[model samples]
Target: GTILLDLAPEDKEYQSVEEEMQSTIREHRDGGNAGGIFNRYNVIRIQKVVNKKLRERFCHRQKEVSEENHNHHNERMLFHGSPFINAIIHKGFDERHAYIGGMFGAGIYFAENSSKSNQYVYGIGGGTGCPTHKDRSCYICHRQMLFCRVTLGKSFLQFSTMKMAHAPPGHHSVIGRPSVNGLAYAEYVIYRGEQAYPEYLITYQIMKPE
Candidate 1:
C-alpha cells in the first residue's frame, strides 16, 4: 500500500529516473537476505502508512518495553549478535511457548546474543498459518522440524546499520521468515540509545488468502 517516490525526473544527465530511484533505494536499503531489519526511511514510512490505516479503521495504541524490564530480561537471557536474534531476546519472549512453523516450513530454531552463556533453547513450528492447506493441515503434513540456529559471538560489526523505530507502548515486535504463501512478515524493537524505553512493531501480508 506504499508508493515509491521518484525524486529525479528523466534528464540528459540521468538517463532513467526509474533506474535512478531503484539504485538509490537499493543503495540505502540492505540487500541481504536476513529478515526483521530495514533502513530508517522504509521503516518510518511503513510505520506511518500502517498506523494511519489502522487508526482510520480502529483505535489502537503502539507498544513499547521499558528499560527496567529490558534490564531485567538481560539479567537472565543470552543472545546472538545478529540483529534478528538480539531483537527477539531484548524483548524477552518465552521461547518454550513460541510456535515456530506452519507456512514457512518445519524447523527447530534457536538464537543467541552477546551474553556470556553459550547455552541455547529449542522450539518448534514456523509461527505462521498455512493458506492452501487446511487450518490444521500443517500439524499432520509437516513434521520433523529442521534444526537451525544462529550463534554469532560478540561482533557489533555484524549487526545491521539501520535503526529500528520504537513500537508503541505495551507491544513487542516479532520477526521471522515469510510464509510459504509468499507473505512477508517482520517485527522490530527500536531501542533509543542511552534510554531504557524501546518500541515494538510488526507488519505482515497474506499474498494469497485461503
Candidate 2:
C-alpha cells in the first residue's frame, strides 16, 4: 500500500523579523552580505573615545579588585552573581577594547529572572520532594540569586547577583537584604565585532554601593 496526496509546495521558511535584523546588523558591521542596509541605520561611531574612557576609569583598578578578591577568601562571599558578572566586565573594559561610544541603540528592553527558580526540589523532610511547577513560585530556602538581561542594539547584556546560600557546616551563612528598588549588580556593553560581540560586550561596570 502506498499513500499519495495532492499538496501544494510548502511555503518558504523565512527568518523572524528579529533574526533578519540581527543578520543585517552583522553584515553591516562586517562590511558584507547586506548592501545599502548600513545607510538606513545610524551606526554610532565612537568606539575609540568610549574605549579610552573605559580604560582610564577601569584599567587602573583591576589590581585593586583582584586583591580584594584574594583578601576576602576567608570571609563569606556575598552576592556571588554580582561578582561573577563584574569580573567579566572588568576584563572586557580593562583588557579588551569593547566599549561603544554613547548609549546603546534605541528600543532597548530589560528582563529579570531568578537563577535557580526553575530547579526541582528534592529530599525535603527526608522524603522525595515534589517537582517544581512552572505556574507557581518556589520556596527560596537557600541563598537565591537574581539575574537580569538588558537589550542593546541587536544584542543584549546580562548581570547577576552572587548566590546567597545557607550557612556552611561550620560557618555562618550571611543573608544579604534583597534590593528594594533593584540593586545595580553590573553593567555590560555588547559591541558589534568584539569576541563577545556575538553574545555580549566586554566593557562593563560592577556597582560599588557606598
Candidate 3:
C-alpha cells in the first residue's frame, strides 16, 4: 500500500492548496520582519496521506467530540508542520513529539495559514529527485507541511498563553487568537493525540540556484 500518493501538478487540490497558501502571503510581514512565501518558492508537490488505523480512530473521536459540541463536530481541515513528515504519515500526530508548545501548553499545534505552518517545517535531503517518501533526497524541497482533519470541538480562545495541559473546563481545544485578521502566525492546540489526522503533505521549494 502506498503511504503517500504524489498529487500531480494539475490536480485541483494542488491548485486549491497553492491558491489558499498564496492568499495568506500577500506581502505579509510583522514588526519590521520580512517574511511570507510570495515569489520565494517554486515547486508545489502535494502528497495524499493515509493510515487506516489513524483514520478509524479519528473518525470515532470526531463523532464523540461532535456530540459534545452541541452536535457540531467542527471537523476542520487545517494545517500542521513537522521536521519529519514521515513520522506523521505513519503514526499520525502525537503530542509527545510536539515541539514549540507551552504557548497553549504542550500539545499538538495547528495553524490556519499555509505560510504560517510553512515556517515550522525543516528541510531535508539534497538531490534533484526524491526516490521515496521515507529516507529521501530532494534538492528541490523536503520542506513540507501536512494538511489535517482536526476536530476543534468547542474550542476555548486563548487571549494569552495559558500553559495548559488540557483545554479549559468544557472545551476540547484551545486557539491562539492573533492581534487582528490576516492569519498572523495563528495556532490551535489540542491535548489529545487522536484529535486530528494528517490528511496530506505539501512539499515545496524555496528559491535556490545551483
Candidate 4:
C-alpha cells in the first residue's frame, strides 16, 4: 500500500521539488522549443506518492541493472504526462496500454525536460495537447505530467526513429538524440512497465499562447 499527500509550497520538501523541476527545464531547454518552453506556468499542486511496495521494486530492479551493467547512477526521475493516470494510481503503469508506437517503438515514453511531457497533458484551463480519444476517460480534468523513478540501466542512444517491442539485446532502455542529436527535445524509453514508478504527480496551469 501507499500514501498520497498534497504538498504545501512553503514546505522545504515542496520547495526543493519545484526547484528541481525548473532547473531541469532550464538545463535541458536546448535550442528547440526555446520560446515555447520557459518558466511559463505556475505549479498548481504536487501530490507525492510514498509507495514502499512499488518504490521497493524499482530500487530492486535498479540495483540489478547496476550490478549487471557494472556501475551505479542508472536511476533518475523522469516526466510522463497523460489523462489516464487513474489506471496508474490504482495499479501500476500499465505497459499493455501503450497502444501506439513511437519514435523509439511501443515503449512507455518519458522525458528529461518538462515541456515535452506538458505537451501531452490533458483537460485543463489552457487545454491539452494530447491525442483525442473516443473514451471520456482520457480527460484528466487538468494539465499535468508525472515524475517517475526510472531505471535506465544500459541505455542505447539513437539518432533516428526506430521501432521495437523491447530494448536491444543487452541494453535496458533507449534515449533519443538531444540538441546534439538533432531533436527539439530529449526523450527516454523503457520497454518494461515495472522499470518506472510514478513518484510525483504535478498539476499546473499553462500560460495561454497568443
lDDT of model 3 at residue 70? 86
- Compared with the true structure, model 1 gives a TM-score of 0.17
Instruction: List candidate 4 stretches off by more than 4 Å.
Output: 23-39, 123-141, 179-181
Native-to-model Cα distance after best TM-score fit, residue 21 in candidate 1, in Å: 20
Q: What stretches of model 2 exceed 4 Å from their correct place?
A: 1-46, 50-54, 71-210
State the lDDT of candidate 4 residue by residue for 90-127, as single tens digits: 56775687625578778888887776666555532113
What TM-score fits each model?
A: 0.17, 0.17, 0.79, 0.79
**How many Å off is the CA of 127 in candidate 1?**
7.7
Each candidate structure's count of clashing pairs: 22, 11, 1, 0
lDDT, each prediction? 0.22, 0.22, 0.69, 0.70
The parts of candidate 3 lying over 4 Å away from their true place are 26-40, 123-141, 180-183, 208-210
Output the lDDT of residue 149, model 3: 86
**Candidate 2 C-alpha lDDT tens digits along 1-210:** 111122222312112211222232222122322121122222111011123434443333433333544432222111112212333333331213221221222111111211111111121111222234221122222211112222122222212333222112332112222244533222233221111211121121111123
After superposing all C-alphas onto the true structure, candidate 2 shows an RMSD in angstroms of 23.4
Candidate 1 ranges with C-alpha deviation above 4 Å:
1-92, 95-128, 131-199, 206-210
